[PDB]
Design a protein around this nucleic acid. Sequence first.
RNA 1: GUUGACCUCGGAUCAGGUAGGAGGACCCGCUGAACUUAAGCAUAUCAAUAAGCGGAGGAAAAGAAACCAACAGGGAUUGC
RNA 2: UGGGCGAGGCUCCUUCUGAGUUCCCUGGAACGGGACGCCACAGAGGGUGAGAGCCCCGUAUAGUUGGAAGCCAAGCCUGUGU
RNA 3: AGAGACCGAUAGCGCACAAGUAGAGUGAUCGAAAGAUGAAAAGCACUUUGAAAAGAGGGUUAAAUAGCACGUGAAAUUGUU
RNA 4: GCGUGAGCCCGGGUCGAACGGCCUCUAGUGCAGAUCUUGGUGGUAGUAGCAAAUACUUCAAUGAGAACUUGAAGGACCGAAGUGGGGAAAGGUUCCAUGUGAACAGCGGUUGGACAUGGGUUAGUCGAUCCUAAGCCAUAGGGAAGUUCCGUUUCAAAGGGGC
RNA 5: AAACUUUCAACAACGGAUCUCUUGGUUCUGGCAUCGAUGAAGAACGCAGCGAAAUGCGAUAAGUAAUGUGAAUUGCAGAAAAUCAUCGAAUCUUUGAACGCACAUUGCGCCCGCCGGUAUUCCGGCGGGCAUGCCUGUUCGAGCGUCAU
Lengths: 134, 50, 86, 122
Amino acid sequence: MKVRPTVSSSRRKARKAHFSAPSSVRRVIMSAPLSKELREKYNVRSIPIRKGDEVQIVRGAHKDKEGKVTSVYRLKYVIHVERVTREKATGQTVPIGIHPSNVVITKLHLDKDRENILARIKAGREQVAKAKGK
Amino acid sequence: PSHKTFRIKQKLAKAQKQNRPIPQWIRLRTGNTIRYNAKRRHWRKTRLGL
Amino acid sequence: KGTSSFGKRHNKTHGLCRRCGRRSLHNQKKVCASCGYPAAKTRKYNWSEKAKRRKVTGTGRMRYLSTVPRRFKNGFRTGVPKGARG
Amino acid sequence: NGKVKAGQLWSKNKEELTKILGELKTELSQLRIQKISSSGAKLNKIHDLRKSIARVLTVINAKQRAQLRLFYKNKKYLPLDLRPKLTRALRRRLSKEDASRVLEKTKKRLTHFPQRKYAVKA
RNA sequence: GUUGACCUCGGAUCAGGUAGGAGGACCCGCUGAACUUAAGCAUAUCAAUAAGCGGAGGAAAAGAAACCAACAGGGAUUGC
RNA sequence: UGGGCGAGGCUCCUUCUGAGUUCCCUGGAACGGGACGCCACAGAGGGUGAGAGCCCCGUAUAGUUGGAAGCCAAGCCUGUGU
RNA sequence: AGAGACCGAUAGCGCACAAGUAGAGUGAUCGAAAGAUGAAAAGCACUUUGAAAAGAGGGUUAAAUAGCACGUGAAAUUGUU
RNA sequence: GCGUGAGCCCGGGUCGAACGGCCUCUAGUGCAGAUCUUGGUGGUAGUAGCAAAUACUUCAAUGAGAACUUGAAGGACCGAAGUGGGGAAAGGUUCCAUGUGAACAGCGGUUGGACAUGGGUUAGUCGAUCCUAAGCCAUAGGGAAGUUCCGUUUCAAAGGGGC
RNA sequence: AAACUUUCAACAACGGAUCUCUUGGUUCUGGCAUCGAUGAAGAACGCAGCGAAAUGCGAUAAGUAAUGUGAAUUGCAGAAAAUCAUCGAAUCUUUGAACGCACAUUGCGCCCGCCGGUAUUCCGGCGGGCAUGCCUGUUCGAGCGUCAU
Ligand SMILES: [Mg+2]
Ligand SMILES: [Mg+2]
Ligand SMILES: [Mg+2]
Ligand SMILES: [Mg+2]
Ligand SMILES: [Mg+2]
Ligand SMILES: [Mg+2]
Ligand SMILES: [Mg+2]
Ligand SMILES: [Mg+2]
Ligand SMILES: [Mg+2]
Ligand SMILES: [Mg+2]
Ligand SMILES: [Mg+2]
Ligand SMILES: [Mg+2]
Ligand SMILES: [Mg+2]
Ligand SMILES: [Mg+2]
Ligand SMILES: [Mg+2]
Ligand SMILES: [Mg+2]
Ligand SMILES: [Mg+2]
Ligand SMILES: [Mg+2]
Ligand SMILES: [Mg+2]
Ligand SMILES: [Mg+2]
Ligand SMILES: [Mg+2]
Ligand SMILES: [Mg+2]
Ligand SMILES: [Mg+2]
Ligand SMILES: [Mg+2]
Ligand SMILES: [Mg+2]
Ligand SMILES: [Mg+2]
Ligand SMILES: [Mg+2]
Ligand SMILES: [Mg+2]
Ligand SMILES: [Mg+2]
Ligand SMILES: [Mg+2]
Ligand SMILES: [Mg+2]
Ligand SMILES: [Mg+2]
Ligand SMILES: [Mg+2]
Ligand SMILES: [Mg+2]
Ligand SMILES: [Mg+2]
Ligand SMILES: [Mg+2]
Ligand SMILES: [Mg+2]
Ligand SMILES: [Mg+2]
Ligand SMILES: [Mg+2]
Ligand SMILES: [Mg+2]
Ligand SMILES: [Mg+2]
Ligand SMILES: [Mg+2]
Ligand SMILES: [Mg+2]
Ligand SMILES: [Mg+2]
Ligand SMILES: [Mg+2]
Ligand SMILES: [Mg+2]
Ligand SMILES: [Mg+2]
Ligand SMILES: [Mg+2]
Ligand SMILES: [Mg+2]
Ligand SMILES: [Mg+2]
Ligand SMILES: [Mg+2]
Ligand SMILES: [Mg+2]
Ligand SMILES: [Mg+2]
Ligand SMILES: [Mg+2]
Ligand SMILES: [Mg+2]
Ligand SMILES: [Mg+2]
Ligand SMILES: [Mg+2]
Ligand SMILES: [Mg+2]
Ligand SMILES: [Mg+2]
Ligand SMILES: [Mg+2]
Ligand SMILES: [Mg+2]
Ligand SMILES: [Mg+2]
Ligand SMILES: [Mg+2]
Ligand SMILES: [Mg+2]
Ligand SMILES: [Mg+2]
Ligand SMILES: [Mg+2]
Ligand SMILES: [Mg+2]
Ligand SMILES: [Mg+2]
Ligand SMILES: [Mg+2]
Ligand SMILES: [Mg+2]
Ligand SMILES: [Mg+2]
Ligand SMILES: [Mg+2]
Ligand SMILES: [Mg+2]
C-alpha cells in the first residue's frame, strides 16, 4: 500500500503517464530481465533493453526464439528481433513487435556506459542487502 | 478587386497556401486520426471575412 | 425590401483590426467593435463570460509568460552550471 | 564538410567563427539554389548547414556578451540587456540594505533588550 | 551702472529613473438597477445586489482606543 | 552593549533497492484453472497478446553513493565604556 | 499535487477528437457534430469478369457477418424466402 | 417454467470480458403522451414536379457510354440603352496548361467557374503615395467619481533664415 | 389461382440503441505567489527533406547554446543519438499598453555615425536614435517679482 503523498494510485493518471511518457522515460519503462547466467555474473536483475542486445523470447507465440535486438521502437513500446518476422500478402517480410518484458536478455551489448550502469546497480543492490542484513 | 492592399494580398496568399489536401504520408503514421482536411475552403462555398 | 435590397450590399462597415485581427474595425468610426482599439484598454465586459474567455490569458501562445514558473521554481537564478563549456 | 560541433567553436576567435559562418551561409544558400534544379539527397544537408550557422552565431554572441560583461564589471551603469532580468516587481522592490535599515532609536533598544533565550521550569 | 545673488516660471532627444496594459476567483472604494415579494401598488423588498468605473496583493483590508462598558471592571486588529 | 567562528542537526540535488516467469490443461496469446515454491516495513497503481506481489516500471523503509552549500545551532575565540 | 459511495460519449465543461474549432452574423456576439478494427496491419498477394466502381475465387487472422461504410449491433423502416 | 402482477429463471442463436444472489446503505432510480428534447425512419411516392428568356439539324472524330464534348456544314437569336469590348465596388485564383474514379453541374456528361498536379500578375511616365473638402483625432486648457467629454487655435513663453 | 395488402418466422438491409471500455470532465482537499516600457497578455505572418491543421518555434524559426541521461528517430528517406529530460546562456519577424508622425498606406519624416556614387546639402546601402505625464539633478534662460553695489 502506498503511503507517500507524492505517489498517486490513480488509474487515469498512471495510464496517461505511461502512454504519454517521453522517450527517456520509455527507455526505463522498456526494461528486460537478464538471464540466470548474466544475473549471477553481474548481480543485476533487470536493465533497460538496447539495440544490439541478444534476447530469447519467453512469452507469446514466438517462445524460445532467440536473436539480436535490431530496433527498439519506443513509439510503439516494442522491440524487433532478428528473424522473428512475418509475411504480408505480397510476401514481403516485416518484423514482429515484441514487448521487452516478454523476453530475457541472454547476451548484453557492453560499453563503458552500459557498464557504469551495471556497476551502479550492483553496488546499490549489495549495499541494500548489507543494510538489511545488519 | 484588382486594387488590393498589401495586407489583403498577404491574407489571400495565406488562404491560398492553406487550401490544399493533407499529405498522403501523414495517414501512415502510428496513431494517426486525420482522414482529410477538415478546414478546406472553396471560393464558391464559404466566404472568408477579408 | 428583402431580396432586392440585399443586392445593394457591396460596401464594408468593418475592416480588419490591427490589434485583435477580427473584421470588427468600424471603417468610419475607426474603432474596433471587439477589442476597443485604439483605446489603450482592451474592451471587456462582465456580462459576457464567453467573450471574456475567448480572449483571456492562455488562449494564445504565451511566448513569455509560460517560462516564468520554471524561472521562479529555480529562483530566477543567473549564471551557468558549475562546470559548463563556453 | 558537414556538421560543425560546438565543442570545436569555443576555442576560435570571433573572426574565425564569422569566417566559418560565411562558408556555411554560402554552402546553405547554394545548397537551396543547387537542390531546386537537381536531385541532391543533400536537400537534407540544409538542416545541418542551418544548425551549424545557428551554432556559430550562438558562439559569437556568447563570446561578445562575456567580453561585454567583463568590460562593464565594476561600472555603475551597464546596458539593459546585460542587466539581470528577474521580474518587474522584483527589480522594483527595495534593496536588502534599505529594507533592513532601522532607526537609531530602534537600534539602541534592540542592542540593549533583544529577545532572550529562556526556559521556564515546570 | 552692469553684472552678481534669490524668488517664481520655463527650454533641452540634457543625466538617471518612474507610470500606463494584462489579470481582476478572492480584496479596497465609487456608481448603481429592474425583474421579484408584498397575492394589486407608490414606502418597503430584491439590494446597500447585478451591470458600469477606479486601485492592490499573495492575501488584501483592519489594527494598537477620542473603544467597550457601568462591572469585583475589561483592554490593538481579524476570524469561528 | 561590539565583532568572528562554529561542531552538530534540519534542508536541497544526485546513485541504489524483495521475490517464479518451475511443471501440467485450455487458449492465437495465461495474466485463467491445477500442482509446487518464494518475497512482503513492498498484496497502491499501471503495462505486458485474458483477473500477474515474485515478467517490467513503480510501490515500503529508513538508509546509502557523490555534490552544492540554503538555514538553525550547543559551545568556543576576541574587543570595551569616552 | 492528491483524492471521490460523482458522470460515463444525447452523460460529464460548449469542447474525451486539428473546440471556443468548423460554420452563421456588418457587428456586438452566436456556436456545433464528431471516441472504440485487431494482440499484432498481419489493412487481402495472385487468378478471373468488368470501361470503371466493383464482383467471383483465393489469401491474413482465433475470428472478416472484425475489411478503414471496421467491437457488440436493438427498434422504427425495407428486401427475399 | 414460476408469479395475480410489476417481474424472475431456463433452452437455442449471436457475441466477446466482465457479472450476479442475499442483508444493510445510497440516489441524477422505473415513460406513450408534455404542438416534449436529440437522433433516426416511414406512408404520401417513383407522386408534385424538372413548361419565362423563339431552336435546333446532318456528317465525322473521341469515348464503355454523346441531345446538352469537339470539328465542319446548315438553320437561328442577341441586333450596338447588345447575349459585344473594357472598368469601379465585391470576390480571391474562379485565369492558363495537363489529367480525371467518386461527389457537384435538381437529365446525361468524354465536358466544367468541379476535382487533382503544375504554372501565371514585370511601371520614374497607369494608380496609390502628395494636396485639401465635408468630417475625424491630437495638443493648450476646461469639465467629469471615472470609462472619458468639450476643445482644433481656442485665457499657450507653441517657429525659421543667414554668416 | 396469382398479384396486392396484412400477420407470423428465418436470413439479408437501414440505423446506431444496448453492453463493456475511457490519456476527458466535475467536485473536494493540500502546497505555492511568479505578468509587463529589460516591452506583457493578445493578434498577424512565416519556419520541417517530404505538412494543410494541431503542437512547437522566430530569418540562429518543428529550433541554437549549456547540463543530465546514455543509442535512437521512425510514415518514407537520410545520418552518425534523441520530436529525450532539465534548463541558469542566447536568438526572438510585423505588431500590440506600443513610443518619430501615421496606418483602410508594408505611407511620410528628422538626428548621429559609417560605406559608395565627384558631395555637410542630393541619391543608395548599413547601424544606432527621435512618444507622453511626472520626480531628482544638470545646464541654458525669462520676468522693474525682487536684493546690494
Ligand atoms: Mg444604396
Ligand atoms: Mg495611440
Ligand atoms: Mg488564438
Ligand atoms: Mg535623457
Ligand atoms: Mg520619460
Ligand atoms: Mg491598470
Ligand atoms: Mg406584486
Ligand atoms: Mg401575483
Ligand atoms: Mg404588476
Ligand atoms: Mg438596501
Ligand atoms: Mg460588479
Ligand atoms: Mg495568510
Ligand atoms: Mg496591509
Ligand atoms: Mg496610543
Ligand atoms: Mg479587542
Ligand atoms: Mg524492483
Ligand atoms: Mg496449448
Ligand atoms: Mg489486463
Ligand atoms: Mg495459472
Ligand atoms: Mg500488475
Ligand atoms: Mg458532450
Ligand atoms: Mg453518438
Ligand atoms: Mg455539446
Ligand atoms: Mg462570419
Ligand atoms: Mg463504434
Ligand atoms: Mg476465412
Ligand atoms: Mg457477427
Ligand atoms: Mg466481430
Ligand atoms: Mg459492427
Ligand atoms: Mg425490425
Ligand atoms: Mg477483448
Ligand atoms: Mg429522473
Ligand atoms: Mg418515448
Ligand atoms: Mg401518462
Ligand atoms: Mg424530430
Ligand atoms: Mg419526411
Ligand atoms: Mg409526373
Ligand atoms: Mg411549372
Ligand atoms: Mg418538358
Ligand atoms: Mg424556353
Ligand atoms: Mg468509336
Ligand atoms: Mg440544346
Ligand atoms: Mg426579338
Ligand atoms: Mg434578329
Ligand atoms: Mg450611350
Ligand atoms: Mg471580355
Ligand atoms: Mg462588360
Ligand atoms: Mg471603397
Ligand atoms: Mg478555365
Ligand atoms: Mg479535359
Ligand atoms: Mg445531374
Ligand atoms: Mg451522372
Ligand atoms: Mg465526369
Ligand atoms: Mg473517356
Ligand atoms: Mg479548384
Ligand atoms: Mg500619374
Ligand atoms: Mg510615395
Ligand atoms: Mg500636410
Ligand atoms: Mg476630442
Ligand atoms: Mg484638462
Ligand atoms: Mg394476433
Ligand atoms: Mg448499418
Ligand atoms: Mg455506453
Ligand atoms: Mg518582443
Ligand atoms: Mg523611442
Ligand atoms: Mg522611449
Ligand atoms: Mg490615403
Ligand atoms: Mg526626402
Ligand atoms: Mg562619398
Ligand atoms: Mg544616407
Ligand atoms: Mg534607421
Ligand atoms: Mg546637462
Ligand atoms: Mg533674469
